[PDB]
Design a protein around this ligand. Structure first.
Ligand code: BLA
Ligand code: D3O
Length: 242
């Protein structure tokens, strides 16, 4: 749980709410710890500018090879929540991810998705059906995905929330995604070796494309340098499996 977090009480309220919702969804799963490189938990660094503070929590279950919740703060103003549930390819589940970035003046970016791992870039039929049933959410300020964002599903939300009502609507949609995802993980069956390979490739591709995110990289570089940032992005955030 998040009562021991040093960052949490200082983060944007939407970020606090979403972190609680994610922890609540994971709490009663068959969790084991997942050891990050160098058993990383808390880390802080500064070069010539602002300090970056990061808290990492990571778990695994039989269906999810790596469940990573990262909270971060740059200086006084910039707050970040990062979460990815990396599936075990044997079960063919999609990739849950979300990213929230907030400054003093409010949340600038809120993105969440259940991303495909199939070569045809479609979600499994059960997900399509369940997601369609939620209906189209209405948000006033949508943002267009960057070029490397071809990895995201047609259900991807990428917005700037315009008011508290939209903040709460976005959090609820993420809770709905997680409820669907946790349910489908109970009914998933181990796949064939050939299908497992296809899902593994989809996850590798997701990770390679997420590494092209310069907005993330530049934050890390300004606090820790180029070599540290490359190691962090490739080995901690978006590790390529074999
Ligand atoms: C220490 C960790 C960490 C940092 C520092 C970080 C920074 C970060 N991510 C950003 C955007 C972004 N973040 C994402 C998406 C994602 N990013 C993910 O990590 C995941 C899992 C998704 C999607 C599920 C996208 C698409 C953008 C916008 C990129 C752009 O505008 O070019 C931005 C710009 C925000 C804005 O334009 O308003 C910053 C500063 N994100 C982090 O996770
Ligand atoms: O991650």
């Amino acid at each position: 749980s998040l009562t021991n977090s040093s960052l949490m009480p200082t983060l944007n309220p939407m970020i606090q709410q979403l972190a609680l919702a994610i922890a609540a969804s994971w709490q009663s799963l068959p969790l084991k710890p997942y050891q990050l490189p160098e058993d990383l938990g808390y880390v802080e660094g500064r070069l010539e500018g602002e300090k970056l503070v990061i808290e990492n929590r990571c778990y695994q279950t039989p269906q999810f090879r790596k469940m990573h919740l990262e909270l971060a703060k740059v200086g006084k103003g910039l707050d970040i929540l990062h979460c990815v549930m990396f599936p075990e390819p044997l079960y063919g589940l999609p990739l849950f991810g979300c990213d929230i970035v907030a400054g003093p003046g409010g949340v600038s970016a809120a993105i969440a998705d259940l991303s495909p791992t199939q070569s045809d870039r479609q979600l499994p039929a059960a997900y399509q059906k369940s997601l369609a049933e939620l209906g189209q959410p209405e948000f006033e300020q949508q943002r267009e995905l960057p070029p490397w964002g071809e990895i995201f599903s047609e259900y991807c939300l990428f917005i700037r929330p315009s008011n508290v009502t939209e903040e709460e609507r976005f959090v609820q949609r993420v809770v709905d995604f997680l409820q669907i995802h946790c349910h489908q993980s109970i009914v998933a069956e181990p796949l064939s070796e050939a299908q497992t390979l296809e899902h593994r490739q989809g996850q590798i591709h997701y990770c390679q494309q997420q590494q092209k995110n310069d907005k993330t990289r530049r934050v890390l570089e300004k606090a820790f340098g180029e070599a540290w940032a490359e190691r962090y992005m490739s080995q901690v955030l978006f590790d390529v499996i074999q």
